[PDB]
Amino acid sequence: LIEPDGGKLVELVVTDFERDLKKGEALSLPRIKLSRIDLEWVHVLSEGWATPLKGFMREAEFLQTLHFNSLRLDDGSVVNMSVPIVLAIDDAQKHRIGDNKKVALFDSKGDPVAILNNIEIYKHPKEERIARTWGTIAPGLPYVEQTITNAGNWLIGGDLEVIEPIQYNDGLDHFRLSPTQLRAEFTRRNADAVFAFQLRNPVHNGHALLMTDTRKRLLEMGYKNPVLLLHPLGGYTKADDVPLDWRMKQHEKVLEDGVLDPETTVVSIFPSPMHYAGPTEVQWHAKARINAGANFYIVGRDPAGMSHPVEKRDLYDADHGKKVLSMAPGLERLNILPFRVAAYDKTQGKMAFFDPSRPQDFLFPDGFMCPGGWKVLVDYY
Amino acid sequence: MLIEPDGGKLVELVVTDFERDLKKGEALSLPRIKLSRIDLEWVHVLSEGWATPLKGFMREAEFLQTLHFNSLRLDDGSVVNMSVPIVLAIDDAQKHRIGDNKKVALFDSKGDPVAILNNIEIYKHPKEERIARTWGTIAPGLPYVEQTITNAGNWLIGGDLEVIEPIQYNDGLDHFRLSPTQLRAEFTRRNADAVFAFQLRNPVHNGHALLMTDTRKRLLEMGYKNPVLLLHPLGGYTKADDVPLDWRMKQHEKVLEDGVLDPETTVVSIFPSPMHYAGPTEVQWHAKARINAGANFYIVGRDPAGMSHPVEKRDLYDADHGKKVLSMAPGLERLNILPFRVAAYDKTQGKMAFFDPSRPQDFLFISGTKMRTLARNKESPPDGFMCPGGWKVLVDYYDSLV
Ligand SMILES: Nc1ncnc2c1ncn2[C@@H]1O[C@H](COP(=O)(O)OS(=O)(=O)O)[C@@H](O)[C@H]1O
Numbered sequence A: 001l002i003e004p005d006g007g008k009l010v011e012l013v014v015t016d017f018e019r020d021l022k023k024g025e026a027l028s029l030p031r032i033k034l035s036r037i038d039l040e041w042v043h044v045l046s047e048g049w050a051t052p053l054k055g056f057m058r059e060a061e062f063l064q065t066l067h068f069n070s071l072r073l074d075d076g077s078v079v080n081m082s083v084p085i086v087l088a089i090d091d092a093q094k095h096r097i098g099d100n101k102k103v104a105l106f107d108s109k110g111d112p113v114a115i116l117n118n119i120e121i122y123k124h125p126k127e128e129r130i131a132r133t134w135g136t137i138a139p140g141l142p143y144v145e146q147t148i149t150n151a152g153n154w155l156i157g158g159d160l161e162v163i164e165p166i167q168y169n170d171g172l173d174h175f176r177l178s179p180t181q182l183r184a185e186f187t188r189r190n191a192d193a194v195f196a197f198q199l200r201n202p203v204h205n206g207h208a209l210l211m212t213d214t215r216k217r218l219l220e221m222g223y224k225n226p227v228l229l230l231h232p233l234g235g236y237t238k239a240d241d242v243p244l245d246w247r248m249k250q251h252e253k254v255l256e257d258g259v260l261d262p263e264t265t266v267v268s269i270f271p272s273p274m275h276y277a278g279p280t281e282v283q284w285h286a287k288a289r290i291n292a293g294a295n296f297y298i299v300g301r302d303p304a305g306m307s308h309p310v311e312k313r314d315l316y317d318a319d320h321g322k323k324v325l326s327m328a329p330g331l332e333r334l335n336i337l338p339f340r341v342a343a344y345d346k347t348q349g350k351m352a353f354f355d356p357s358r359p360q361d362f363l364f365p366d367g368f369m370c371p372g373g374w375k376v377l378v379d380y381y
Numbered sequence B: 001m002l003i004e005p006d007g008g009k010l011v012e013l014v015v016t017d018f019e020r021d022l023k024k025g026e027a028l029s030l031p032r033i034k035l036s037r038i039d040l041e042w043v044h045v046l047s048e049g050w051a052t053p054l055k056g057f058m059r060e061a062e063f064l065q066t067l068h069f070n071s072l073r074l075d076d077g078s079v080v081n082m083s084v085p086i087v088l089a090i091d092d093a094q095k096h097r098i099g100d101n102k103k104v105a106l107f108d109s110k111g112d113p114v115a116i117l118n119n120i121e122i123y124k125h126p127k128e129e130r131i132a133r134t135w136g137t138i139a140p141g142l143p144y145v146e147q148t149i150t151n152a153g154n155w156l157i158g159g160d161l162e163v164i165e166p167i168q169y170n171d172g173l174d175h176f177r178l179s180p181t182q183l184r185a186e187f188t189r190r191n192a193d194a195v196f197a198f199q200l201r202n203p204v205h206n207g208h209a210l211l212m213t214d215t216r217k218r219l220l221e222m223g224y225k226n227p228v229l230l231l232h233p234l235g236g237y238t239k240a241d242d243v244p245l246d247w248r249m250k251q252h253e254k255v256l257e258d259g260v261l262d263p264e265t266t267v268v269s270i271f272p273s274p275m276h277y278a279g280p281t282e283v284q285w286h287a288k289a290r291i292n293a294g295a296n297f298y299i300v301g302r303d304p305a306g307m308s309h310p311v312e313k314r315d316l317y318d319a320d321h322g323k324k325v326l327s328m329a330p331g332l333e334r335l336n337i338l339p340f341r342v343a344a345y346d347k348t349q350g351k352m353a354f355f356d357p358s359r360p361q362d363f364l365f366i367s368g369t370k371m372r373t374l375a376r377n378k379e380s381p382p383d384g385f386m387c388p389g390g391w392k393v394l395v396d397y398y399d400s401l402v
């Protein structure tokens, strides 16, 4: 099975039992209250989705991420790191911490979630951080409006100890498998290959085509036990799009109508918030999937893309995600599976790859989505 | 020995004498692109191996690596620094005229064939995304951007560049335009054991001099017996309100003449790159080109390659980021970075010295605008901020603008 970055998973949840010891130690330190998205990053960090990141990003790590989309290690080593994972902090909170080297991170219930050790506070260069991550500045960037635009002229990083595994209690916690649980589950099936499929949307037959086509390629490649890791992203997503709970139902119906084989598919939820930062973000979608133990990564067109909040176009070129991914630092050992655009073929009755020689044949609808999956979606709506 | 050009060997793109005549003829047959002043500067940069091991104008693959990773991957799987796009933009017409030719000729202004671009590929030119990832911002009034990007074509052409003749301007400064090979040959003649480079775009004041003389001191203390300063003013495109290259050279020559810097242990040469004004991103490029010139030490201060935000007034960049970003940049690890903090005029010592935050009221900051204001007002900066000869050249430059 493919090894995590650095050689081992770096999980940051304290042992059983220092949880009481750490709950108590937290009572003597200053307090920062997490917002919803902060806690999701804590959740991300805890399970080791950003291995070997030892906590919220210090200044040198933040800069490395912005400029190079990578992190250097104790050897000359470079791993992929394409998104700032940062805790923002306002003026009153900075003073309130003063000269403390340990701060405590509390959830909105008022309980101690985590201890941040050996902290450093530094400036929050908002415009530049945004320009370097999204490749634009325009207002209306959903992730930017949350957690960046409005609050925090400082950042605080350091080594993080997470007290208790994060549970949202929304009724979906049984889907949120850790990287090491997924590795427990792939090794459970004697999987000789794991192909991941990142998605933020409901599955249609185009997405299925990419997945079904990947199977045969791996069987034709010699693999006896290929496993599809279907991975809806379940962190923050824009209010517009279809919420996680409905998508999970939709996927349940897709897996039901045989369009995807449940016998060889693991469904799990990726805890990370969505950046909507195109080629920059897709590297992170891939980075995590490596740490989750997937050695093949499916990428289609315009991954993690969206329309420009102002102008009449897409933020990004649709082919760049593929291209950038296939040369991204620390992602070389990952097997990339690039695909072209799938749309509805009118000559045939199904989804098929777009044929530039006969554009008149494609619509962008019977066979476009499995009618079971369309029930969830027509209900929800 | 001197530090290696990265990839191993310098990669020059100038054809040999033998093939020279042949190439011009082959060039006159090809579809042709007329080079802007800045395009020609990049051709110069490419020709002499300043961007070694880059084989010409960037292909789409090389363009993306530059924007996202600030590095190029080599065929052995190693990387080298590459933080600024070196590209060639063309419009719908030019594209259409090129058609399906795989070879195109680059012509100067006016009429002369300067290069052939081989095995070309034309790809989309995403200007906004390009400006954001390179400059850290989008804002009207970024000078390099306004000069070659915002009015440029929606396409880029890359390929293998063959430069027919070594570029000369014949402006009375060609004797200072040393190639990296020529620079390496001069360092070796001096038996230098340490080559410390000072990139600059501005007139030399005594703050810059402090950086350079402290460096020589550190190097001597480290054990080096013949440390050599590469005083290396940038000479390609700069914004027009800046002091032009020819005045800066006269100013630099006065600084060496007054003994502020030592003419015997200094090489003075002009760096032919255009100026990006892109701080932490651009500064990597300033360093990478210097490795290729054989400098194994690189001096860097506060806000390298920076400028004020054009629209609002704060700096474009955090002044400490250049040093940091340089110290961890891919492919620059083998270069010795020599970081400095702010130098400023110390009223209490009557000298340029390193800024002391515990007594900030002691320090005077003198900007280019202030210098121009003083000159108009018939006054001078404090005694010791700039050597008299250098300052005199500047008052003459200010007077010429009248
Ligand atoms: N019509 C399509 N044709 C080919 N690939 C697609 C198509 N739509 C989405 N994809 C790919 O399917 C994967 C999932 O994308 P989405 O769920 O729509 O959003 S994304 O943010 O996760 O990229 C991505 O790899 C994307 O590139």
Ligand SMILES: Nc1ncnc2c1ncn2[C@@H]1O[C@H](COP(=O)(O)OS(=O)(=O)O)[C@@H](O)[C@H]1O
Binding pocket: B199, B200, B201, B202, B203, B207, B208, B211, B299, B300, B301, B302, B303, B304, B305, B306, B340, B341, B342, B343, B344
């Ligand atoms: N007052 C200063 N104190 C310390 N370093 C400085 C100072 N002014 C400029 N520098 C440094 O001197 C070098 C050249 O500066 P400039 O000529 O103004 O512009 S630059 O584009 O070449 O960086 C850079 O390393 C810069 O950081």
